[PDB]
Amino acid sequence: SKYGGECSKEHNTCTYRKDGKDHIVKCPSADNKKCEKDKNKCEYDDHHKTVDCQTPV
Ligand SMILES: [Cl-]
Numbered sequence: 860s861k862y863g864g865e866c867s868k869e870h871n872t873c874t875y876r877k878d879g880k881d882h883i884v885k886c887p888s889a890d891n892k893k894c895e896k897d898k899n900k901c902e903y904d905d906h907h908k909t910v911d912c913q914t915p916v
Pocket residue numbers: 879880881
């Protein structure tokens with residue numbers, strides 16, 4: 860139910876892989892969820908319906 864990707868700092872987006880396709884969604888604007896570092900791990904959680912561009916590492 861979690862789908863991983865990488866984020867764009869410039870666009871504040873997460874590009875994640877799900878069911879063979881790449882999907883681009885905006886990251887949150889929240890301080891500790893936005894894409895802070897370019898190409899950082901992000902995740903779309905399809906169960907909780909959330910995006911985080913500061914996935915714990
Ligand atoms: Cl695709």
